[PDB]
Design a protein around this ligand. Structure first.
Ligand SMILES: OC[C@H]1O[C@@H](O[C@H]2[C@H](O)[C@@H](O)[C@H](O[C@@H]3[C@@H](O)[C@H](O[C@H]4[C@H](O)[C@@H](O)[C@H](O[C@H]5[C@H](O)[C@@H](O)[C@H](O[C@@H]6[C@@H](O)[C@H](O[C@H]7[C@H](O)[C@@H](O)[C@H](O[C@H]8[C@H](O)[C@@H](O)[C@H](O[C@@H]9[C@@H](O)[C@H](O)O[C@H](CO)[C@H]9O)O[C@@H]8CO)O[C@@H]7CO)O[C@H](CO)[C@H]6O)O[C@@H]5CO)O[C@@H]4CO)O[C@H](CO)[C@H]3O)O[C@@H]2CO)[C@H](O)[C@@H](O)[C@@H]1O
Ligand SMILES: OC[C@H]1O[C@@H](O[C@H]2[C@H](O)[C@@H](O)[C@H](O[C@@H]3[C@@H](O)[C@H](O[C@H]4[C@H](O)[C@@H](O)[C@H](O[C@H]5[C@H](O)[C@@H](O)[C@H](O[C@@H]6[C@@H](O)[C@H](O[C@H]7[C@H](O)[C@@H](O)[C@H](O[C@H]8[C@H](O)[C@@H](O)[C@H](O[C@@H]9[C@@H](O)[C@H](O)O[C@H](CO)[C@H]9O)O[C@@H]8CO)O[C@@H]7CO)O[C@H](CO)[C@H]6O)O[C@@H]5CO)O[C@@H]4CO)O[C@H](CO)[C@H]3O)O[C@@H]2CO)[C@H](O)[C@@H](O)[C@@H]1O
Ligand SMILES: [Mg+2]
Ligand SMILES: [Mg+2]
Ligand code: NA
Ligand code: NA
Ligand code: NA
Lengths: 520, 520
């Protein structure tokens, strides 16, 4: 039962179709990885403040997964016969709460979800500073309470109940949060980072302990029942789309150009050019891959600048021999390509059974590399070696978990020895580490946006710099947080007003979170 | 080079010139409120966007090709007793092509057109429209009297295969058309010319076996460069299918669809159907899914396009199609959700390269006779009501005989003619019924359709401003009543252009009524 509550909360993390709209609408534009689909460009790409769209994480987690995890934790707390499920619940509670606070800032946590259990309504919004304090304390204690000789964890879609891997994940999350606070508090950050490395079970040191939620393959449906079906990855469902021929996932130029201009082996693993005239209405079957034809004919790729739609600017196309040939037996096909020259997200990332990414060994290597550049006491491996290991693991992650074609040693070496190289100054090293992390986090948009904001890399420019300033109703600078749902002023007035007063008296998506020291 | 060959080319060019036919899709079909919703039709004619290049198509095409060549051939065969038949046919076709020019622009070169082969005879004067019409009656009368079936064979005639008696019938029927045209501006001359034509050698077109239809061949539609010099197929039908046929097919205007549907017209679903085009060929109307009966069974409203509307504005109310859901099982690109498919489209029978080039029909002759009888002219012993009824029956049978539409039975015809297709009782009711039925007949003859709407005042059409689209009408609120002269004329035929515009007070505006158009 607590074990069943874990299962459902894991499924809801990427399985909730309503919630996943937030990432397509906002995060993927803010990190300049996708742009051109109507939803992504309209909301995040052009800074449309929309309180209902911004509210999806808040409502989803406080009404469902976070609420239920809190209940289950409470019911198993201080029970020596339930220490493993209780500890696992505490780790997952920290994880879900980290998404909330890294989106909105101060928020209910210590007093959350206690109305039925403790008659405690109107929970205060804990200060982000204090939420992060609690993350380190909860994770450390959970690691120390876990005992493999005790209860079996049975509803775990990440590690199949292996509580030693749960210690590795908890200590890796301590690394992530330590590095998160390293601008505002380098001293505490270094201490937390070093403590985690020394903690029981260690950290995730290779991909065999990557934390990935397992999802199944279910046909993509947008009917009403689909909004209560968490069995499939709903982020992948939306990246395919409710309107998949008009509004697929086109890549942003910032990301496509980072890959292409650096010679990254992942360029045409993450993206392809497809003609979709024969594509299924409900799955990415029967697409025509024109990528190699475009390369052979010298046709320029036209990825979407921040602020651009697939149709604005309208691209320069070409006449496809592949499509002309196909039209002979499939007369609905046209040979004239237009928006097909704009790179799209590859089919490997559009599957109901894509994993729900929580944390990878590649990220741990990048965290270790940055801590080493920062002169923390993290071990005997050079920062450069840790960096190279993180890049290799990030590239292999796509092969292992999405079926992308394997990258040879020669291909990796060619890349790492040219534009993927680590660099020779601290700023170049931190730039390379965090640019590589941004690519790794493509399938983890919550972490991708948090790490862009925290590290300041890549250095992203407003859509105004690309010519789209006339559309920026919600202001010029890329938002650094989302606003609280307006109904909170009705359901939780005092606590909401208190949080807003702490920000200076307004709820503004340009206000930096506590751990975010400056913006870009 | 041979005059008989020049006749063939000029006939083919009349509807075979893919560049020139854009004018009808862009302007005429919107001004007569028969098609609306296709981008081109709504943007230009539906929202009064004046564009001199678009308005110039008839002038440029005819004066550089078909009319020029007809004039050359007429000169080469004139005053030669052994060439009287080809010469007379050329004179009749010359009048026909000239009538389209003057009914579009007003005063225009005629007596002085097409010289230049002579010497420095460039810079022709614009003959006054009133005089052009007088010349039409004289030319047609003389050609009828010079024709002699014992003399030269006419060998390249795609209308009548050289049957010169039928050319007499066409010439005298054109005299009826032009006599009725001038019946508001010069009622006494109109009556005299109408009566003279009925009494002339060869008589008029009295049944469908003498309908004047240019025969076109069944060629595949192509929009490549070579297709702009290929006149073998009906290019108006090609354009009504469209260069962008899935995004911008020919949707019907509500004025015309509602006239048909609300009158119980048997032609309603002969001229129009609702289609889902997800599997339709890119270059032909093959593989469309007819949903019309399904909509009727499910009670889904037809949503034809008001004047000024695009297919996407207003966005219509759709439904979920059982037919399409079934087709999606084996054709997964199909969606079952219909949206703009609820807007009636032009039926496939009107989207064929072998659709005839309509010049003049026996149905029109019956409607002209009926109107002349209401006007108390001396036209014979048939009642106006019977002539009207014969006109409607011929107009309906015209679609069966020439477009492959399902035949209308006597019982179906009688049911319509006895109810909402009835002739009516006051003079205004009779004139409205005659000219509303003529408007339907002239659907496949847009030059005549627009002329007769302007001349008769029926149907009574309202500006797109009355349907809510006034904000978009850059070229004025009233529906245009002529097109302006080409900029090529004001640039390179300036003295003659200046003389013509001086007769309109120095103006050259699409709201200025032509001489035969007494009011709007
Ligand atoms: O002629 C011979 C000659 O030819 C030569 O070739 C020529 C050729 O002939 C010629 O045709 C060609 O011309 C080119 C021309 O074709 C081209 O046209 C372009 C044009 O330039 C573009 O501007 C145009 O762009 C369009 C685009 O197509 C549209 O798709 C787009 O539509 C936008 C919509 O997508 C968008 O819709 C969104 C809704 O607004 C929104 O409300 C909705 O919200 C949903 C949401 O998505 C859901 O996720 C959500 O789900 C909720 C959930 O949130 C909650 O949790 O739960 C609920 C239930 O529980 C659940 O419901 O729901 C909400 C609510 O429903 O999302 C929608 C999207 O999904 O809306 C916006 C705004 O309205 C739309 O904008 O619009 C754009 C424009 O705006 O595209 C056309 C193409 O069609 O132009 C070029 C350049 O001019 C031309 O060149 O030219 C060639 C070459 O010259 C030959 O060369 C020659 O040889 C021959 O001779
Ligand atoms: O999700 C859970 C939930 O879902 C529920 O269902 C939801 C669902 O989720 C959601 O997606 C859906 O959202 C709906 C949304 O989809 C819909 O979107 C609409 C939108 O509202 C519209 O506004 C939009 O309209 C677009 C339209 O699509 C475009 O096509 C159109 O494009 C126009 C162009 O077509 C046009 O192009 C022309 C060029 O401008 C012009 O230059 C060019 O000229 C050519 C010319 O044509 C030639 O003839 C000529 O030929 C020359 C010749 O002249 C010479 O002689 O010779 C030459 C060669 O020799 C020769 O070339 O040449 C020239 C060449 O240029 O012609 C072009 C046309 O062909 O350009 C204009 C202007 O730029 C374009 O406008 O634009 C419009 C917009 O303006 O469409 C989208 C759809 O895509 O919105 C609705 C309503 O908001 C949404 O509802 O909602 C559903 C329902 O809720 C489920 O129900 C639930 O269960 C689930 O839970
Ligand atoms: Mg920052
Ligand atoms: Mg008039
Ligand atoms: Na889903
Ligand atoms: Na043609
Ligand atoms: Na008949």
């Amino acid at each position: 039962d607590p074990n069943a509550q874990l299962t459902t909360a894991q499924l809801q993390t990427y399985g909730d179709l309503s919630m996943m709209e937030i990432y397509r609408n906002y995060h993927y534009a803010f990190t300049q990885q996708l742009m051109g689909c109507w939803n992504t460009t309209n909301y995040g790409g052009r800074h449309t403040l929309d309180n209902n769209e911004m509210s999806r994480i808040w409502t989803s987690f406080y009404t469902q997964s976070l609420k239920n995890i809190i209940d289950a934790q409470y019911r198993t707390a201080e029970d020596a016969e339930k220490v493993n499920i209780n500890s696992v619940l505490r780790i997952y509670r920290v994880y879900l709460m980290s998404i909330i606070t890294d989106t909105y800032g101060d928020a209910p946590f210590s007093e959350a979800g206690l109305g039925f259990l403790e008659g405690k309504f109107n929970p205060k919004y804990d200060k982000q500073e204090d939420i992060y304090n609690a993350f380190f304390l909860e994770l450390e204690d959970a690691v120390n309470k876990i005992d493999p000789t005790k209860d079996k964890v049975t509803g775990d879609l990440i590690y199949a109940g292996d509580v030693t891997k749960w210690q590795q994940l908890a200590n890796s999350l301590r690394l992530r949060f330590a590095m998160r606070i390293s601008s505002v508090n380098p001293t505490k950050a270094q201490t937390e980072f070093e403590n985690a490395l020394a903690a029981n079970g260690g950290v995730i040191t290779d991909a065999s302990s990557d934390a990935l939620i397992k999802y199944m393959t279910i046909a993509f449906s947008f009917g009403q029942e689909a909004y209560s079906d968490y069995r499939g990855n709903s982020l992948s469902q939306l990246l395919f789309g409710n309107d998949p021929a008009n509004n697929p996932s086109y890549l942003c130029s910032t990301f496509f150009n980072q890959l292409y201009n650096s010679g990254d082996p992942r360029t045409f693993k993450i993206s392809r050019c497809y003609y979709d005239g024969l594509m299924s209405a409900t799955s990415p079957d029967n697409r025509v891959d024109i990528t190699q034809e475009m390369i052979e004919k010298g046709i320029a790729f036209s990825p979407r600048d921040p602020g651009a739609y697939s149709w604005e600017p309208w691209p320069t196309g070409y006449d496809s021999d592949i499509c002309a040939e196909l039209a002979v037996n499939n007369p609905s096909v046209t040979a004239t390509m237009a928006r097909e020259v704009e790179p799209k997200l590859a089919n490997n990332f559009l599957k109901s059974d894509n994993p729900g990414v929580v944390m990878t060994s590649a990220e741990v290597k990048f965290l270790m590399a940055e801590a080493t550049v920062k002169k923390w006491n993290v071990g005997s491996v050079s920062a450069e070696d840790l960096y190279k290991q993180g890049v290799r693991a990030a590239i292999d992650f796509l092969t292992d978990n999405y079926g992308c074609t394997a990258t040879t040693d020669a291909e990796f070496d060619a890349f790492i020895q040219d534009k993927g190289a680590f660099g020779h100054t601290d700023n170049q090293k931190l730039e390379a580490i965090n640019t590589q992390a941004w690519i790794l986090h493509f399938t983890n948009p919550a972490e991708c946006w948090a790490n862009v904001r925290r590290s300041g890399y890549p250095k992203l420019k407003s859509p105004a710099e690309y010519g789209f300033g006339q559309y920026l109703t919600g202001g010029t600078e890329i938002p650094v947080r989302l606003c609280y749902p307006v109904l909170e002023s009705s359901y939780n007035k005092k606590s909401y007003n208190e949080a807003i007063e702490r920000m200076g008296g307004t709820d503004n998506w340009h206000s930096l979170l506590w751990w975010d020291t400056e913006n870009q």
